[PDB]
Design a protein around this motif. Structure first.
Motif, PDB file in Angstrom:
ATOM      1  N   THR A  34       0.638  -1.391   0.155  1.00  0.00           N
ATOM      2  CA  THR A  34       0.306   0.549   0.093  1.00  0.00           C
ATOM      3  C   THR A  34       0.735   1.239  -0.426  1.00  0.00           C
ATOM      4  O   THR A  34       1.514   1.499   1.014  1.00  0.00           O
ATOM      5  CB  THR A  34      -1.311   0.350   1.301  1.00  0.00           C
ATOM      6  OG1 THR A  34      -0.286   0.292   2.303  1.00  0.00           O
ATOM      7  CG2 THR A  34      -1.739  -0.880   1.304  1.00  0.00           C
ATOM      8  N   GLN A 127       4.901   6.799   1.864  1.00  0.00           N
ATOM      9  CA  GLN A 127       5.108   6.267   2.470  1.00  0.00           C
ATOM     10  C   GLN A 127       4.743   4.451   2.053  1.00  0.00           C
ATOM     11  O   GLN A 127       3.799   4.368   0.848  1.00  0.00           O
ATOM     12  CB  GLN A 127       4.367   6.306   3.392  1.00  0.00           C
ATOM     13  CG  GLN A 127       5.097   7.703   4.445  1.00  0.00           C
ATOM     14  CD  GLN A 127       3.864   8.121   5.347  1.00  0.00           C
ATOM     15  OE1 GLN A 127       4.204   9.772   5.724  1.00  0.00           O
ATOM     16  NE2 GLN A 127       2.920   7.505   5.872  1.00  0.00           N
ATOM     17  N   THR A 129       3.985   0.680   3.576  1.00  0.00           N
ATOM     18  CA  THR A 129       3.364  -0.474   4.284  1.00  0.00           C
ATOM     19  C   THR A 129       3.092  -1.827   3.072  1.00  0.00           C
ATOM     20  O   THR A 129       2.589  -1.560   2.229  1.00  0.00           O
ATOM     21  CB  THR A 129       1.809   0.201   5.213  1.00  0.00           C
ATOM     22  OG1 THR A 129       1.022  -0.146   4.660  1.00  0.00           O
ATOM     23  CG2 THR A 129       2.272   1.883   5.235  1.00  0.00           C
ATOM     24  N   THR A 131       0.613  -5.296   3.755  1.00  0.00           N
ATOM     25  CA  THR A 131      -0.717  -6.054   4.189  1.00  0.00           C
ATOM     26  C   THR A 131      -0.548  -7.061   4.428  1.00  0.00           C
ATOM     27  O   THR A 131      -0.554  -7.689   2.831  1.00  0.00           O
ATOM     28  CB  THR A 131      -1.866  -4.989   4.581  1.00  0.00           C
ATOM     29  OG1 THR A 131      -2.811  -5.223   3.025  1.00  0.00           O
ATOM     30  CG2 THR A 131      -1.611  -3.268   4.245  1.00  0.00           C
TER      31      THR A 131
ATOM     32  N   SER D  11      -3.427   0.184   4.835  1.00  0.00           N
ATOM     33  CA  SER D  11      -2.571   0.821   6.286  1.00  0.00           C
ATOM     34  C   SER D  11      -2.242   1.896   5.985  1.00  0.00           C
ATOM     35  O   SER D  11      -1.832   2.089   4.618  1.00  0.00           O
ATOM     36  CB  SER D  11      -1.629   0.263   6.700  1.00  0.00           C
ATOM     37  OG  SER D  11      -1.540  -0.427   8.143  1.00  0.00           O
ATOM     38  N   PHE D  12      -1.678   2.512   7.003  1.00  0.00           N
ATOM     39  CA  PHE D  12      -1.313   3.393   7.104  1.00  0.00           C
ATOM     40  C   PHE D  12      -0.514   3.894   8.033  1.00  0.00           C
ATOM     41  O   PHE D  12      -0.775   3.861   9.279  1.00  0.00           O
ATOM     42  CB  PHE D  12      -2.320   4.635   6.207  1.00  0.00           C
ATOM     43  CG  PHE D  12      -3.610   4.891   5.836  1.00  0.00           C
ATOM     44  CD1 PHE D  12      -2.919   5.612   3.938  1.00  0.00           C
ATOM     45  CD2 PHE D  12      -3.988   3.752   5.569  1.00  0.00           C
ATOM     46  CE1 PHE D  12      -3.732   5.111   3.336  1.00  0.00           C
ATOM     47  CE2 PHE D  12      -5.459   3.899   4.188  1.00  0.00           C
ATOM     48  CZ  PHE D  12      -4.652   4.731   3.067  1.00  0.00           C
ATOM     49  N   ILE D  13       1.202   4.527   8.698  1.00  0.00           N
ATOM     50  CA  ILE D  13       1.704   5.215   9.137  1.00  0.00           C
ATOM     51  C   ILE D  13       0.639   6.147   9.960  1.00  0.00           C
ATOM     52  O   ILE D  13       0.096   7.266   9.956  1.00  0.00           O
ATOM     53  CB  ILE D  13       2.763   5.738   8.385  1.00  0.00           C
ATOM     54  CG1 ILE D  13       3.744   4.856   7.358  1.00  0.00           C
ATOM     55  CG2 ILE D  13       3.920   5.915   9.581  1.00  0.00           C
ATOM     56  CD1 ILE D  13       5.107   5.771   7.346  1.00  0.00           C
ATOM     57  N   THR D 129       0.673   0.798  13.575  1.00  0.00           N
ATOM     58  CA  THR D 129       0.061   1.135  12.133  1.00  0.00           C
ATOM     59  C   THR D 129      -1.234   0.812  12.410  1.00  0.00           C
ATOM     60  O   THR D 129      -1.348  -0.414  12.956  1.00  0.00           O
ATOM     61  CB  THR D 129       1.132   0.414  10.795  1.00  0.00           C
ATOM     62  OG1 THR D 129      -0.511   1.068   9.949  1.00  0.00           O
ATOM     63  CG2 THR D 129       0.942  -0.374  10.737  1.00  0.00           C
TER      64      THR D 129
END
Lengths: 137, 19, 289, 137, 32
Positions: A34, A127, A129, A131, D11-13, D129
């Motif tokens: 993501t 950024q 990430t 999952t 998701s996100f930080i 997160t």
């Protein structure tokens, strides 16, 4: 009535805008990436993908950074330089507008993402990430 | 290689078509 | 565990449609032929009660002309295992958004299908009689413009002997007509108290947005700012059940392209056969600038 | 055969060691939490959850960070002295085993995690997160 | 081989007609 979704598809950070991180996925069976921009980009940002192997010192410590080979399918006509899994967040992607991707076939134990050369200053404003999904342990 | 989102500034407009 | 319902929001506009007004012909193998009879010639004369012999007249022609018809084909790939799981049926969705694409391409072709392997759209034929709005001289400039009198005279001048002829145009034209105001400050149409709207049930208003508008989107020409561009398309009016004909041979059909398909990949192929042609394009007429 | 699982549960930080990040949770209807340490810890550590409302200036940007009230379930034995919701992670948590959490009843449009005062040095070792579940739009 | 369909275009207008309005009367041998 939000169910606890930390367990049952957790996530971790892969790229904080300054540095990459190995993210263990061997205990899982599905996963994806993501992307989320924090500011307006300037050009198309290419990101290289890497997979690693358990360093022979300890089966639970990061080893080298092997570049995962791109795998094409039938409708693929635009193969890269011999095939190396690499993504590119295009321009005209404002903040509060996320993207997401995945690799067709997995290889290794854990994954990592790095800014492809030239997109570093722009990678500093995005950024990444990861999952996961399907873990059975 | 894809995703979509929302919160695009509504920003209404005008259309006037006189003679 | 979540719950599933059986609804599917769409958010997909196709366009307006004109495949119903044209004369529909189901057909067989290509190179169809037909008659064209030129004109019934003056056969008799009359006669004065006395003589015992007539005088011949001129006969007409039949012009057994004929017509062709084009095809549409496409292919698409699939994975084998990826189809079994992932509950939603992708295959039927592709059948749907192949028939739909064929439909919209047929519609666009019947209008602007320029010649070579392209169903000759009656727009590019340019054989319908066309009228154009007259220019107006605002403060000695003679700029192209379009007032409601142009429509008045365009639609009324149709020879009613052909029959009820349907009129088509873009909704931008509809709106620019709706925004017309008299000198008193009142509106020129329906005056349906905030009611006009686009009933367009059967009479002579029929809107297609996949047509080229003379408004250049909007705020362009007529707009308080810069005027029209001359020679621009406006609308059409024709008895499409006899002015133009669409012909269909085989419905959209699919088949797994045996050869090129494996135990890990699947190859498909779809196709169809359709075309169109003009009848007496002296039936309908066109509006321009 | 990993699915594209970034078009779901993206998701996100939220807290990358030393910086908080208000995450938008409007279109989503469920959300959890994922805690991950990067090194060894000294003592247990608490994190204060906050939320945001759309500041009148712009409806798609978070306002201030308003404290989250703790709601108790049945058969509860204790309540935070202030009633304000906050999470706690015990000492002796290895940086190879994630931790999960979830507030049972949300409020606001953005969520944020802040290092509780007196437990801020260990925050550097902590990365938290959040993933979400629904789309609804 | 060419295909033959079963339609025929006319493209020839007669006029409007006023034979329907007038009083119709069928007759026999002349001088009514």
């Amino acid at each position: 009535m939000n169910f606890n979704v930390g367990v049952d598809f957790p996530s971790f950070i892969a790229w904080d805008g300054e540095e990459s991180f190995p993210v263990k996925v061997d205990g899982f069976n599905q996963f994806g990436f993501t992307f989320k921009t924090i500011a307006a980009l300037t050009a198309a940002t290419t990101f290289n993908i890497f997979y690693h192997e358990p360093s022979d010192a300890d089966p639970c410590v990061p080893g080298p950074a092997i570049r995962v080979p791109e795998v094409p399918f039938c409708d693929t006509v635009l193969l890269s330089e011999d095939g190396l899994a690499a993504v590119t967040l295009p321009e005209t992607v404002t903040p509060d507008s996320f993207c997401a991707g995945t690799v067709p076939c997995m290889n290794g134990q854990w994954i990592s993402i790095a800014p492809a050369t030239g997109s570093e200053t722009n990678a500093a404003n995005v950024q990444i990430t990861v999952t996961m999904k399907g873990a059975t342990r | 290689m894809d995703c979509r989102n929302l919160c695009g500034a509504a920003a209404p407009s005008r259309l006037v078509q006189p003679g | 565990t979540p719950q599933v319902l059986a609804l599917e929001v769409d958010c997909n506009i196709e366009c307006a449609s004109l495949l119903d007004l044209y004369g529909q012909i189901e057909v067989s193998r290509s190179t169809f032929t037909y008659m064209k009879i030129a004109d019934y010639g003056q056969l008799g004369e009359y006669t004065c009660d006395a003589k015992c012999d007539a005088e011949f007249g001129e006969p007409g022609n039949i012009r057994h002309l004929e017509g062709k018809t084009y095809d549409y084909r496409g292919v698409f790939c699939f994975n084998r295992k990826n189809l079994q799981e992932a509950n939603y049926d992708f295959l039927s969705f592709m059948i749907g958004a192949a028939q739909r694409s064929h439909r919209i391409n047929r519609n666009q072709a019947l209008m602007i299908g320029k010649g070579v392997n392209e169903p000759k759209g009656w727009l590019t034929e340019n054989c319908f009689p066309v009228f154009q709005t007259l220019p107006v001289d605002v403060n000695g400039t003679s700029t192209p413009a379009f007032l409601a009198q142009d429509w008045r005279r365009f639609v009324t001048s149709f020879p009613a002997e052909y029959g009820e002829a349907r009129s088509v145009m873009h909704q931008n034209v509809f709106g620019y007509l709706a925004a017309m105001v008299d000198a008193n400050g009142r509106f020129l149409f329906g005056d349906g108290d905030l009611t006009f709207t686009p009933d367009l049930v059967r009479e002579r208003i029929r809107i297609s947005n996949c047509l080229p508008d003379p408004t250049e989107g909007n705020t362009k020409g007529g707009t308080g700012q810069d005027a029209f561009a001359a020679g621009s398309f406006v609308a059409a009016q024709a008895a499409w059940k006899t002015a133009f004909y669409a012909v269909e041979k085989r419905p959209m059909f699919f088949e797994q392209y045996e050869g090129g398909s494996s135990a890990w990949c699947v190859k498909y192929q779809f196709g169809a056969e359709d075309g169109g042609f003009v009848g007496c394009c002296e039936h309908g007429r066109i509006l321009q600038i």
